[PDB]
Design a binder for this molecule. Structure first.
Ligand SMILES: Cc1cc2nc3c(=O)[nH]c(=O)nc-3n(C[C@H](O)[C@H](O)[C@H](O)COP(=O)(O)O)c2cc1C
Ligand SMILES: Cc1cc2nc3c(=O)[nH]c(=O)nc-3n(C[C@H](O)[C@H](O)[C@H](O)COP(=O)(O)O)c2cc1C
Lengths: 194, 194
């Protein structure tokens, strides 16, 4: 199998979601050694913002480049089986770095199509894992719109099989930060050894 | 009073939410002529993406400029009474243009502060109006995370008094597009003449 890892934190090597993504990779390589793993860091190698000129490209030099970057990202997504998405929460949303990727991957006739019975995703047979870190504690509450957003967006393009790994309470001190890292690594181990 | 209008569509003068924002302005000037109205188009005059270097600024030349742009935006927000936010839905989220504004307005000790009983907003006494356009029909359903996100983010910074104006079904043909424009202008008239 082929595993794609999407990093989106703006905190570099201090990132909680990056360090848990690197723990998922290390665990997958030890348990599955032949599988090919691709890491794409959307903070270190940023995707442009979807503006008026790019939504026309989906042509000028810059439209052409966005179209080809789009096509690249989509072929990469479709090439992989297991899609690991690091989704830190900033200001109640996902990171802009992740959002810009989504905005180039969502393409009519490519990653979804219109049907009589509504849009249907075209990125099929994938298993996703969301690693989502938060300062506070939102899970199953009204302030977590990241979780259902992710479900909705991934579901739209075809990715219905999504498992969530939460690391909450990071801002609450060393016992709660360690709880969040221990409970997210335990969740990660259950997925890697299922 | 002072009314701030935030445009965030990437569709320019073809924008549904821009044309309803311009209808709100025209209606407010005719009904309230002395009130000062400020329009800020976040697509025509973009706000940078929050990255690692900017989240440090909140210093390098570019950190200094982001800090001053932040301070500007926040003083502008706090200067106005009535905050009109055009929030088109792209890929189940708000526009990146709007998100980048939020990411520079949300500042600890400035637009919210930490308390014993949780964060509290510091932008007080405001009345917000969200004009939110969608191709499809999401209202009160599980695919509308934009509405509760907006409530949550605005509530966080202090803006608890939010009225939503929906323009849905834009993609459904001329009768449904006209329904959406007629029902959003009627909603706008009820707010302007309350
Ligand atoms: C710009 C910014 C905004 C934040 N917003 C929120 C938030 O809305 N809710 C929350 O619970 N924590 C918030 N946090 C804290 C992050 O969610 C927490 O630090 C998380 O570990 C980030 O993952 P990361 O280290 O992989 O970037 C924010 C942090 C940053 C830097
Ligand atoms: C990049 C892009 C993505 C879109 N995503 C969605 C969507 O997730 N859900 C929806 O119902 N409509 C969607 N639409 C349609 C817009 O919501 C609809 O055109 C709306 O009128 C946009 O407001 P605006 O004209 O002010 O930009 C999208 C349109 C664009 C351009």
């Amino acid at each position: 199998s082929k595993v794609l890892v999407l990093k989106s934190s703006i905190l570099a090597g201090y990132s909680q979601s990056n360090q848990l993504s690197d723990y998922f990779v290390e665990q997958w390589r030890e348990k599955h050694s032949a599988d090919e793993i691709t890491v794409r860091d959307l903070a270190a190698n940023p995707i442009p913002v979807l503006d008026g000129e790019l939504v026309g490209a989906l042509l000028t030099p810059r439209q052409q480049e966005a179209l080809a970057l789009s096509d690249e990202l989509i072929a990469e997504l479709k090439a992989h089986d297991v899609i690991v998405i690091a989704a830190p929460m900033y200001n109640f949303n996902i990171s802009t770095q992740l959002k810009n990727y989504f905005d180039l991957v969502a393409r009519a006739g490519v990653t979804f199509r219109y049907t009589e019975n509504g849009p249907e995703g075209l990125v099929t047979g994938k298993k996703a894992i969301v690693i989502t870190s938060r300062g506070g504690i939102h899970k199953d509450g009204p302030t977590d719109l990241v979780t259902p957003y992710l479900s909705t967006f991934l579901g739209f393009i075809g990715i219905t099989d999504v498992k969530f790994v939460f690391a909450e309470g990071i801002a609450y001190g060393p016992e709660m930060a360690a709880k969040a890292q221990s409970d997210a690594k335990a969740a990660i181990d259950s997925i890697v050894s299922a």
